[PDB]
Ligand binder design. Structure first.
Ligand SMILES: *[C@@H]1O[C@H](CO)[C@@H](O)[C@H](O)[C@H]1NC(C)=O
Lengths: 49, 49, 49
């Protein structure tokens, strides 16, 4: 049984530089293939996270 | 009450990356083509050097 | 043939440069099998007139 206690006063959020984060795997195995271009939704490097 | 905690949030964008697979099938390094002229040059040649 | 490729728990196949399948994992037994093409080559007939 939830009770109402939340407070919602404003606060200035902080930022930081997200670098080289947010890359995930494909389905199959690619072995020692130095390159494989892939187009998808990612997190651009050095972004304001 | 729930003590203290923090977390980071970022929003994805549609990007095309270039992935390097290690001998053991691991994505050790990646390159983002739209980050800067050098990275886009790296993407165009399909090489990291 | 028997092969030593570190397949991830969710990874099944292994792709070549030319999109051809090379390594698989037997559904019955989780051992990793490596596929190779059967021996082939050119034939050249040396003939006097
Ligand atoms: C793959 O894993 C083995 C496990 O010992 C390790 O020795 C080897 O260096 C790894 N390969 C690479 C390219 O790091």
């Amino acid at each position: 049984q939830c009770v109402n206690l939340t407070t919602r006063t404003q606060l200035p959020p902080a930022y930081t530089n997200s670098f080289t984060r947010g890359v995930y795997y494909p389905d199959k195995v690619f072995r020692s293939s130095v390159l494989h271009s892939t187009q998808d939704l990612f997190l651009p490097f050095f972004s304001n996270v | 009450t729930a003590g203290a905690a923090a977390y980071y949030v970022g929003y994805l964008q549609p990007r095309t990356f270039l992935l390097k697979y290690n001998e053991n099938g691991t994505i050790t390094d990646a390159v983002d083509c739209a980050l800067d002229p050098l990275s886009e040059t790296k993407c165009t040649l399909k090489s990291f050097t | 043939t028997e092969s030593n490729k570190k397949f991830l728990p969710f990874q099944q196949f292994g792709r070549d440069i030319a999109d051809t399948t090379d390594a698989v994992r037997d559904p019955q037994t989780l051992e990793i099998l490596d596929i190779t093409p059967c021996s082939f080559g050119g034939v050249s007939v040396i003939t006097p007139g």
